[PDB]
Design a protein around this nucleic acid. Structure first.
Length: 49
DNA sequence: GGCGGCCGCTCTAGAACAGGATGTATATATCTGACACGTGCCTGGAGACTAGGGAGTAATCCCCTTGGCGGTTAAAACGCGGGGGACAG
């Protein structure tokens, strides 16, 4: 059971890491995730007025 | 002495229960008639082979649906009045 759980963890490890490589940095971005819409919303004429 | 109130008595009726009735549930007896087993083929699938052609895969590309924004006014939702219909009878 230990050996099979170990190799199960081993081949799950690669997909786990490749998913976390693109997930973690985007997760750390909080304001920048909504920046693509907030910049369009707030850099307008009436907002600056 | 008269009358309202209370309790007992008999009348009546709803309902649970038992018995009769008639059309089906079964216990054999026996028929019987297709069921499946055996046989004899024999005719269509399978091994093997030849050839070729349509899709799997790779690449591209441009295109089209998803996410994502607001504006706005049409509309969903809430609530009040009420009114005509579903349903019990």
């Amino acid at each position: 059971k230990d050996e099979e759980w170990r190799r199960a963890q081993r081949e799950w490890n690669k997909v786990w890491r490749e998913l976390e490589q693109k997930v973690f940095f985007k997760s750390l971005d909080h304001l920048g995730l909504t920046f693509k819409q907030a910049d369009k919303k707030l850099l307008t004429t009436k907002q600056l007025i």
